[PDB]
Amino acid sequence: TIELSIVIPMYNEEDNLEHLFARLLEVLTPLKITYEIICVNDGSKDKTLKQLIDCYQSNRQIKIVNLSRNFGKEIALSAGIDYAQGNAVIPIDADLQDPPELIHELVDKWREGYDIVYATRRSRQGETWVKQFTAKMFYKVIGRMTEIKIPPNTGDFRLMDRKVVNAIKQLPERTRFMKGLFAWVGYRQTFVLFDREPRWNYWKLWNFALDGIFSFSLLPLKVWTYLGSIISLLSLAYASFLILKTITLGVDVPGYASLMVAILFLGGVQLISLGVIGEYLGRVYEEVKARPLYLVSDLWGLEYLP
Amino acid sequence: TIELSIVIPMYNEEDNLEHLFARLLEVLTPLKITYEIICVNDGSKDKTLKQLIDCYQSNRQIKIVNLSRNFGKEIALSAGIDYAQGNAVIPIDADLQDPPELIHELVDKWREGYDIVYATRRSRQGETWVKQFTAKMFYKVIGRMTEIKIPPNTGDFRLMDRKVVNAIKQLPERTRFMKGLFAWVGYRQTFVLFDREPWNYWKLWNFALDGIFSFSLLPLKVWTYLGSIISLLSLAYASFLILKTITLGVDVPGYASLMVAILFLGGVQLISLGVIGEYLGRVYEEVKARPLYLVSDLWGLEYLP
Amino acid sequence: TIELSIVIPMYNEEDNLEHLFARLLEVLTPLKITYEIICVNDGSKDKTLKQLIDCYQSNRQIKIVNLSRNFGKEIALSAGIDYAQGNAVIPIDADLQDPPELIHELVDKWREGYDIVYATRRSRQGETWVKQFTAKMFYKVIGRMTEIKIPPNTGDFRLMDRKVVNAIKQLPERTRFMKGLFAWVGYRQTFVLFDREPRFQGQTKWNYWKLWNFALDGIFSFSLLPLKVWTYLGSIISLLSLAYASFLILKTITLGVDVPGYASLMVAILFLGGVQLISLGVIGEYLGRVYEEVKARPLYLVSDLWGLEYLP
Amino acid sequence: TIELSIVIPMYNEEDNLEHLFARLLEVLTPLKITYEIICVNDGSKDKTLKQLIDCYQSNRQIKIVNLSRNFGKEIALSAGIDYAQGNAVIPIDADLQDPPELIHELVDKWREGYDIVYATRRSRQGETWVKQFTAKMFYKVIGRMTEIKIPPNTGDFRLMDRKVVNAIKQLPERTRFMKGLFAWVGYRQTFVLFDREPWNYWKLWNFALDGIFSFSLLPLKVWTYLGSIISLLSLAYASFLILKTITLGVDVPGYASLMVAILFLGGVQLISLGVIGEYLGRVYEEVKARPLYLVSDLWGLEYLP
Ligand SMILES: O=c1ccn([C@@H]2O[C@H](COP(=O)(O)OP(=O)(O)O[C@H]3O[C@H](CO)[C@@H](O)[C@H](O)[C@H]3O)[C@@H](O)[C@H]2O)c(=O)[nH]1
Ligand SMILES: O=c1ccn([C@@H]2O[C@H](COP(=O)(O)OP(=O)(O)O[C@H]3O[C@H](CO)[C@@H](O)[C@H](O)[C@H]3O)[C@@H](O)[C@H]2O)c(=O)[nH]1
Numbered sequence A: 001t002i003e004l005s006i007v008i009p010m011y012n013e014e015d016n017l018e019h020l021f022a023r024l025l026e027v028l029t030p031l032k033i034t035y036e037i038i039c040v041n042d043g044s045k046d047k048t049l050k051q052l053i054d055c056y057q058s059n060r061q062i063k064i065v066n067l068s069r070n071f072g073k074e075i076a077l078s079a080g081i082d083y084a085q086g087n088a089v090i091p092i093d094a095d096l097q098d099p100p101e102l103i104h105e106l107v108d109k110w111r112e113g114y115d116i117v118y119a120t121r122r123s124r125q126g127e128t129w130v131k132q133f134t135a136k137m138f139y140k141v142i143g144r145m146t147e148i149k150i151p152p153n154t155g156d157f158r159l160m161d162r163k164v165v166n167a168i169k170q171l172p173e174r175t176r177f178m179k180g181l182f183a184w185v186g187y188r189q190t191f192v193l194f195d196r197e198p199r200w201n202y203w204k205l206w207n208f209a210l211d212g213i214f215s216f217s218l219l220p221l222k223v224w225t226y227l228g229s230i231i232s233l234l235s236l237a238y239a240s241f242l243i244l245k246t247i248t249l250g251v252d253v254p255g256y257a258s259l260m261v262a263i264l265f266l267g268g269v270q271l272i273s274l275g276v277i278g279e280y281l282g283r284v285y286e287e288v289k290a291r292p293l294y295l296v297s298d299l300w301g302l303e304y305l306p
Numbered sequence B, D: 001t002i003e004l005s006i007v008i009p010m011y012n013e014e015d016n017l018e019h020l021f022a023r024l025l026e027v028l029t030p031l032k033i034t035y036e037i038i039c040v041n042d043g044s045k046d047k048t049l050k051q052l053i054d055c056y057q058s059n060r061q062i063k064i065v066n067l068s069r070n071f072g073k074e075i076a077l078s079a080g081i082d083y084a085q086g087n088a089v090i091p092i093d094a095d096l097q098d099p100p101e102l103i104h105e106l107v108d109k110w111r112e113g114y115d116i117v118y119a120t121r122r123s124r125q126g127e128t129w130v131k132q133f134t135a136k137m138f139y140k141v142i143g144r145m146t147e148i149k150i151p152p153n154t155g156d157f158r159l160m161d162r163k164v165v166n167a168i169k170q171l172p173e174r175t176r177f178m179k180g181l182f183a184w185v186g187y188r189q190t191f192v193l194f195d196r197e198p199w200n201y202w203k204l205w206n207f208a209l210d211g212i213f214s215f216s217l218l219p220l221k222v223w224t225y226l227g228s229i230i231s232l233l234s235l236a237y238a239s240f241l242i243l244k245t246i247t248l249g250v251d252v253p254g255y256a257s258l259m260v261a262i263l264f265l266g267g268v269q270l271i272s273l274g275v276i277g278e279y280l281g282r283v284y285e286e287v288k289a290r291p292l293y294l295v296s297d298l299w300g301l302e303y304l305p
Numbered sequence C: 001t002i003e004l005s006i007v008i009p010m011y012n013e014e015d016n017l018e019h020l021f022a023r024l025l026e027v028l029t030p031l032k033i034t035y036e037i038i039c040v041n042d043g044s045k046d047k048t049l050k051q052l053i054d055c056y057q058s059n060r061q062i063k064i065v066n067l068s069r070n071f072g073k074e075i076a077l078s079a080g081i082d083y084a085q086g087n088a089v090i091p092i093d094a095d096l097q098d099p100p101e102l103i104h105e106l107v108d109k110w111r112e113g114y115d116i117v118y119a120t121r122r123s124r125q126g127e128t129w130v131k132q133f134t135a136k137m138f139y140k141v142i143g144r145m146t147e148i149k150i151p152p153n154t155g156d157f158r159l160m161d162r163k164v165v166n167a168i169k170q171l172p173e174r175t176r177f178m179k180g181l182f183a184w185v186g187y188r189q190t191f192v193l194f195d196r197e198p199r200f201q202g203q204t205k206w207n208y209w210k211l212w213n214f215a216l217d218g219i220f221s222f223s224l225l226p227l228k229v230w231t232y233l234g235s236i237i238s239l240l241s242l243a244y245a246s247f248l249i250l251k252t253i254t255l256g257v258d259v260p261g262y263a264s265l266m267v268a269i270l271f272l273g274g275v276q277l278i279s280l281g282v283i284g285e286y287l288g289r290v291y292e293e294v295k296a297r298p299l300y301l302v303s304d305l306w307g308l309e310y311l312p
């Protein structure tokens, strides 16, 4: 069988093949376990596939997944995990920014009785205040969104057990927020503190933030249609107050004060409509993601359902 | 073959395992029917899983379903029912608030030919009047929402036949209102009255909102109806004001086009919202993917796969 | 094999069972084909199921589909068609509103090469003015929606070939307008004319609220034309608001601000309303796309093949 | 093993079958490969089916797909491609605007290594100002939405590898814009130039909107952003009127709270519409059910089921 599966998404990653493979063989032979290296070429434009082919010729542990197009790092990672058959699957980066020597340590934490072992950086390490505070705010928001409290400073370097991988493959979602989905499974999780070696705008970021906020939970859709419906009721109210202030207290003010009532009433009514729609939209969202109701960790006395 | 399946959602249920299992075994012994007890551990931080393991090692009727995390009582019950293989499935609470001896009566009713046998509280005694009013009103609203009239004062303590369990498992809804869903699967249903031995208010709101919105389109159909009525009234009165400006030349304030624009735009946007809501309700009904019908019996035909 | 299936939805049809079955055996026997009679008990509260059991035990051509609840006539028909294994399936009503003898003519048309044969009533003769005109208008509107232009004065009494039954079973949609669905799956279609007997031409009170519900279901559950006429009649309004809001802006800049202290109000109203109307139109277009995706009808329906095998 | 699948959608294509098949044979026989013609009769209201039947009886290479009714040219092409079992699929027209000789050239490019070989006309020539400029603008707007830059002046004459055909069949979309779908499933594409040899609003507008909307979320994402800026400006400017009315009072005539109410409610409704649009786009992405990735080649691994 295959015990470990190192998944490497690669796009324009030539000139890094030799050093990365040397480090991986250096750190994976002391483990004395049967491993595999699933390298997912994400439509590289340079001579990366040629060197990947040569490496796969030389070594029987490298397996290449060649995507038709450049789908992206997240999608290439998803393909690699889908084609990984090891008991533990470790996504790693091809630029070696996250050290591979920590893979060993990750394996140990996986053998302590854990299922997800995140690799959390010591501290931002670079990324001036402008980024640390934004990361803090986003992490607090998402931690309030979920009920599992994924660790801060988590990236795409991690260890997932076969249970975790099977659970992730059990979610048929196209709008994916990986951190939220990894929290949403909630197995025996942990994190290993690693320090990145001493060696993005707000257009690629803001889009990622919106994808995390909207494609994971209904909380933006629930907080709204709750702020609306606080107003609207406060607009239908005071619209009635204006009705009962013109009916008593004869209207000696400007002759078209009733316009205000209209501006409130329809508006408030419209908001209610929106709220209702939003609620149902959220329900439809939950229905179209088709998430499983539950995930089973272990069974005693029962075989697993098909 | 297992005849009865007692499904218990467990969460921090230590200091209750020995007593609950003792009462359940005492009740189920005189039945003389092959039974199984499925304990669904709902991601408890407490040590109930270890004692569940001990009991499963001691008693061969105990089967444990360990969930990945805490999913809630509803989802834990759904998992336990999905793993249950008995002909009749009885959800029950580990706290033993619901008397397990009532299981006797339940199975007796199941022997009369009733597919669903609810267990309903004889009364709630001199309880808080606010609950006595709110629960009654919510039950009346739900009863108007369905056409089957599910009994009131009913919790998760029920007996479901294998046909009812299979029908429920045929509903792939991820947004579930179990009371309305059990009404929707309209097999032969009855109830047994029991007296219990002598609230978040946020869950009480979220569950009510689920019951209103996660089951039917009736709230969405009474709206886009009232909204359409209000929009039509707005359009009619805007037309009246247009005619009032056109005939009699009303211009006293000297700007009676703001109100016409307000009414016309509000009515048009309200009709647009009503059409969008109608189509969104169709989308919701289609994504819920409920089966069109449900066959309770067949004569001369074999069941379709 | 089973040449013909007779699907009868049933709800409190006690005391109608004997005459219905007598007429059915009267008409179906001379056809000298192998037939089955699928009686769909739609949760009847009367003693219908017991007499159904008696007939099934004494007659081998009766099969019973007992529905758990009362799902309605349309869903009972869907269940019966789902359980019907005949090459041709004929829905029919248990109250003998439609003469079963006409079944014979239907079968004849079925042997002429037609895949759907409708049973069309020649005249209404039970609806003085309002119902016939409203039905004509509704049929014209739904035919404008549909392609094959399903004939009018028609009901659930019909015949479908096994190809048509399988094609209808190929649509996994829950919000169904079967009148339009039978036209969307176009196949060699025809219609035979029949006259309702004078014994059953009474007023048949037309519950107007149920009529309205059926009309809304048919209009809003078969096509997106209500959502496409709007998002066009609403986008025109939005455009004509943004314009003339710009015109008010240029008029106030050019012709002065003689307004009493307003026209910021009117420009704001027009601009916000038009922007929200564009937003509602975009939401409507994408919701129509979501609706079409969610319905998940097959792209095409192959009638016959030559040189190729059918796709599983 | 069929090396080539020609797909001809026909609707009322009588008096042109013999010429079409003569040209197809004169083009395909020199290729010296096993070819297979599939005639998709798109519910013709004509006697073309009889001629197709006689041709199929006489010649073995011709097979027929008869649709229930007239579905459209795109749907007929999809039906023919679904039934096509060749290693390469070449959708061609029965009218023969596209020269079948280019099939040769297309096949040649297919043997160079490319997976999709488009057949693009060099220039419109006859179209002077309106049609060519509007086509250029449409392609320019579409290109930003698409991931791979499709070539200009393209049509439905192309060669698609079995790998590309399988990838396309993996997309279960009911609202299909094939020009963008072929770009989304990017592979080794290319194009071959050729000459075609010497516009109602209810199609050239419906198709354009279908491509704009039914393919990508870009129109919905460009809005709900601009609308959000408009909402933010409305709310900020309403706050400005509030701060202007609490300072120095209200020198404007005393009915200027109407502006505040209008701006605030419009901004709140615009935020609601923006949230609804964002979640509707998420639902659209979920329901289009496009696969996350597409695998072109594998080394050391077997293709997943
Ligand atoms: O997350 C979980 C998972 C499982 N269970 C199981 O559910 C069973 C019964 O639920 P329980 O919470 O013990 O019922 P009560 O506490 O007696 O009453 C509930 O019913 C009230 C009605 O408003 C609610 O306010 C609260 O959920 C709660 O007080 C028990 O065996 C538990 O083991 C939970 O309660 N919570
Ligand atoms: O819930 C159900 C299930 C099945 N059937 C069966 O349907 C058959 C005939 O249906 P029916 O509705 O009685 O047709 P008609 O009598 O010709 O016309 C009715 O069609 C209207 C539907 O809009 C009804 O409201 C009116 O009672 C009546 O005009 C009968 O065998 C019934 O048993 C029902 O009627 N209701």
Ligand SMILES: O=c1ccn([C@@H]2O[C@H](COP(=O)(O)OP(=O)(O)O[C@H]3O[C@H](CO)[C@@H](O)[C@H](O)[C@H]3O)[C@@H](O)[C@H]2O)c(=O)[nH]1
Residues within 6 Å of the ligand: D008, D009, D010, D011, D012, D013, D042, D070, D071, D072, D073, D076, D093, D094, D095, D097, D199, D200
């Ligand atoms: O409803 C259908 C079903 C199938 N086909 C088949 O499609 C093939 C080619 O169709 P064709 O009409 O020739 O496409 P074009 O070459 O692009 O020409 C058309 O291009 C536009 C229609 O898309 C129109 O504006 C033009 O008048 C018309 O010549 C033929 O085998 C037809 O039989 C149709 O044309 N219409």
Ligand SMILES: O=c1ccn([C@@H]2O[C@H](COP(=O)(O)OP(=O)(O)O)[C@@H](O)[C@H]2O)c(=O)[nH]1
Residues within 6 Å of the ligand: A008, A009, A010, A011, A013, A042, A070, A071, A072, A073, A076, A092, A093, A094, A095, A097
């Ligand atoms: O479109 C892609 C597909 C994959 N990768 C891979 O993603 C990993 C990290 O590269 P990145 O540019 O994302 O650096 P980071 O943002 O993590 O600092 C590397 O293994 C790359 O090979 C990438 O960078 N772009």
Ligand SMILES: [Mg+2]
Residues within 6 Å of the ligand: A093, A095, A097
């Ligand atoms: Mg990097």
Ligand SMILES: [Mg+2]
Residues within 6 Å of the ligand: B093, B095, B097
């Ligand atoms: Mg309790």
Ligand SMILES: [Mg+2]
Residues within 6 Å of the ligand: C095, C097
């Ligand atoms: Mg009747």
Ligand SMILES: [Mg+2]
Residues within 6 Å of the ligand: D093, D095, D097
């Ligand atoms: Mg042509």
